[PDB]
Design a protein around this ligand. Structure first.
Ligand SMILES: CC(=O)N[C@H]1[C@H](O[C@@H]2[C@@H](O)[C@H](O)O[C@H](CO)[C@@H]2O)O[C@H](CO)[C@@H](O[C@@H]2O[C@H](CO)[C@H](O)[C@H](O)[C@H]2O)[C@@H]1O[C@@H]1O[C@@H](C)[C@@H](O)[C@@H](O)[C@@H]1O
Ligand SMILES: CC(=O)N[C@H]1[C@H](O[C@@H]2[C@@H](O)[C@H](O)O[C@H](CO)[C@@H]2O)O[C@H](CO)[C@@H](O[C@@H]2O[C@H](CO)[C@H](O)[C@H](O)[C@H]2O)[C@@H]1O[C@@H]1O[C@@H](C)[C@@H](O)[C@@H](O)[C@@H]1O
Ligand SMILES: CC(=O)N[C@H]1[C@H](O[C@@H]2[C@@H](O)[C@H](O)O[C@H](CO)[C@@H]2O)O[C@H](CO)[C@@H](O[C@@H]2O[C@H](CO)[C@H](O)[C@H](O)[C@H]2O)[C@@H]1O[C@@H]1O[C@@H](C)[C@@H](O)[C@@H](O)[C@@H]1O
Ligand SMILES: CC(=O)N[C@H]1[C@H](O[C@@H]2[C@@H](O)[C@H](O)O[C@H](CO)[C@@H]2O)O[C@H](CO)[C@@H](O[C@@H]2O[C@H](CO)[C@H](O)[C@H](O)[C@H]2O)[C@@H]1O[C@@H]1O[C@@H](C)[C@@H](O)[C@@H](O)[C@@H]1O
Ligand code: CA
Ligand code: CA
Ligand code: CA
Ligand code: CA
Ligand code: CA
Ligand code: CA
Ligand code: CA
Ligand code: CA
Lengths: 114, 114, 114, 114
């Protein structure tokens, strides 16, 4: 299945935060309605935050996360969870290698904000 | 039900990150096996990160999140999600008022690291 | 927090299935936009299915699950999870006593259908 | 990532239930520690339960779900969610065609029982 693609409500502010846990430098691309609106880059084996931004979901509400290590696409896994019928998390794990820890870049999207 | 309480694997390094979305200054307490090991304090209405730390789960693996605003406990909601049978998120939302956005402090716990 | 309340997409077919794991006979009330549309009653300590029905979320999309055992409301816990940005589960656990297994009646709501 | 594979607690009773939503007859294979222990077959476009069983996770706790339609493997998506630090769901969607509703066979695994 395609992973890392989420439909948010239109015109909604959301947070995106990425963490790194790999020898490789991670590149996290964030697309909103098919345009790149943020790129986070960094390297850590101890969960450093390599980027955190507030974005708007725009007209279509489509948010897509892509992860690469020097242009090689990582394998992704994702899901969305809703608490209290209101608080949303869109979650991505990624794997750059063969150990299948899926933490090499971890991306958390949250809404609503404010 | 009790919310904000999670069993991690024993003696395991994990990440904890807190975001704020409220007029009120948020105080986030992290307990590991019933002892306070970290406290985050901050204020934002735009999802600012008010703390991020790496901790060890200790003998029992018990991690509890508590959130208060000027000493008044917020109402919590939580769940744990596991992706690819490996990547774990323990998720907390909190509500300091009556609008029930449950984002007033948002806490994300992730493991494994490295 | 209030639990067991979900906003589904409007006018959508959905499944609701209930499982029992308790000495006590479970009564599961399903409301759609604030009207009772199904009641499931049954007893099992081995996960028997005490009801499964197809319902429609109607104009407001509001779905609420309530559980009681011989006239006592059970304590609820709930969340919603979305896979492949499409497959939705709304999940309820309930507790009729003090052991906190939260499985005494388990309710699974799934959509889309067809 | 491999999907539909879960590590349950070892030696634990669990429920497995499958629903069908497709023109195609679904075949759901349940393996426990690499051995087939249940097969559910059926056809519905209205969420009929095509099987529900109680199983034990055995020494390794490994549970794998596989889905095929007339011998062709469906594409799987899965996650595990935990409520109240106690109630577990392992969730599987599958897609037998190109519409990506991922509901063609839906499989719910729940524990603890009793
Ligand atoms: C992206 C990366 O760092 N992956 C692997 C690393 O793989 C790189 C390739 O990506 C690159 O293209 O070629 C080089 C050789 O020129 C290399 O193969 O390989 C290292 C070393 O094997 C591996 O780190 C080791 O991972 C094992 C677990 O499999 C173990 O942790 C060991 O201690 C590490 O040294 C990289 O794996 C990534 O980083 C690790 C630190 C760990 O976080 C893994 O989960 C990552 O996938
Ligand atoms: C902790 C906090 O700031 N909560 C409310 C705030 O509540 C305070 C009480 O905590 C205090 O004890 O008493 C005072 C009055 O004496 C007050 O009731 O009230 C403010 C103003 O109403 C409220 O912010 C408003 O929230 C609404 C939505 O309900 C809306 O966003 C408006 O723009 C706000 O000004 C505080 O609500 C929190 O902060 C908001 C910005 C929002 O993030 C809410 O979700 C928070 O719960
Ligand atoms: C609803 C129910 O069956 N609850 C308890 C049960 O409680 C009932 C009261 O609800 C009723 O008001 O009074 C009767 C006496 O007339 C009784 O107190 O009590 C039984 C017996 O204690 C209890 O089952 C036992 O539960 C323990 C775990 O706490 C353990 O499994 C033991 O083997 C059981 O015999 C009922 O608990 C429920 O059913 C259990 C089988 C189990 O599924 C629990 O999770 C349930 O909550
Ligand atoms: C397994 C199955 O029934 N899949 C499709 C079905 O696909 C079959 C192939 O599996 C087979 O190998 O080849 C034949 C041609 O010989 C055929 O292509 O095709 C039917 C008809 O198109 C399709 O049902 C239709 O699906 C659309 C949406 O794409 C819509 O619901 C329409 O009303 C259906 O008639 C099968 O799709 C499956 O069943 C549907 C009812 C639906 O539940 C889909 O999600 C399923 O994937
Ligand atoms: Ca890796
Ligand atoms: Ca790693
Ligand atoms: Ca609030
Ligand atoms: Ca707020
Ligand atoms: Ca109980
Ligand atoms: Ca029980
Ligand atoms: Ca399909
Ligand atoms: Ca279908």
């Amino acid at each position: 299945a395609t992973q890392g693609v989420f439909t948010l409500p239109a015109n909604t502010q959301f947070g995106v935060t990425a963490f790194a846990n790999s020898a490789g430098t991670q590149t996290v691309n964030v697309q909103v309605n098919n345009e790149t609106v943020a790129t986070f880059t960094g390297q850590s084996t101890n969960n450093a935050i390599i980027g955190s931004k507030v974005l708007n979901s725009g007209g279509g509400g489509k948010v897509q996360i892509l992860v690469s290590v020097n242009g090689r696409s990582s394998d992704l896994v994702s899901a969305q969870v809703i608490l209290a019928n209101e608080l949303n998390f869109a979650l991505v794990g990624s794997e750059d290698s063969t150990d299948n820890d899926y933490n090499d870049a971890v991306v958390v999207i949250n809404w609503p904000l404010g």
